[PDB]
A paper describes a structure:
Myosin VI (Myo6) is the only minus-end directed nanomotor on actin, allowing it to uniquely contribute to numerous cellular functions. As for other nanomotors, the proper functioning of Myo6 relies on precise spatiotemporal control of motor activity via a poorly defined off-state and interactions with partners. Indeed, while they are back-folded monomers in their inactive form, these motors can self-associate to form active dimers upon activation.
SEC-MALS with six fragments derived from the 3HB/SAH junction indicated that a rather conserved region (aa 875–940) can self-dimerize with KDApp of ~19 µM (∆G° ~−6.4 kcal/mol) obtained from titration. This minimal region corresponds to the last half of the 3HB (i.e., the 2nd and 3rd helix) and the first part of the SAH. Crystals of the 875–940 peptide diffracted to 2.1 Å resolution. Clear electron density for all residues from 876 to 937 indicates that they form an extended helix that dimerizes in an antiparallel manner. This antiparallel dimerization is stabilized by multiple apolar contacts involving 13 residues from each helix, and six polar interactions involving R892 with D900, and T888 with S906 (via a water molecule). SEC-MALS confirms that the T888D.R892E.V903D mutant stays monomeric even up to 43 µM (peak concentration in the SEC-MALS experiment) while the WT counterpart is dimeric in similar conditions. Myo6 is unique in that its antiparallel coiled-coil and Lever arm in the dimer are derived from the unfolding of a 3HB, with the contribution of the SAH.
Residue numbers in the entry:
A (entry chain A), B (entry chain A): 876 to 937
Write the structure that this text describes.
């Protein structure tokens, strides 16, 4: 009766909460992947400029 | 740099997802408590009408 309508409403609200959780999870994963790429890019750029300076200090002596 | 802005944005989105999850959890608990009360009320009403009939069948014989 109003029990079965309310059971259906509880099931419908649980699905909405789960689907919204999944969309926010996908926003978080997307931003974290972009963050991971930028952190990697920063490590690579610092790595290269320190190594360039090591070669410049080696070429001054020769 | 844009790394720290993005770390803050990831932290802010995780808080929003958690707070929205909590509000939907409270809608589900609220509907489930109301469902529990109606199911209890239905069991009590069926219980009483069967017991009333048991007393009526006992009083017909006396």
């Amino acid at each position: 009766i109003s029990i079965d309508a309310l059971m259906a409403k509880i099931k419908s609200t649980m699905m909405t909460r789960e689907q919204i959780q999944k969309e926010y999870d996908a926003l978080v994963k997307s931003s974290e992947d972009l963050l991971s790429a930028l952190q990697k890019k920063k490590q690579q750029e610092e790595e290269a400029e320190r190594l360039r300076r090591i070669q410049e200090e080696m070429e001054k002596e020769r």
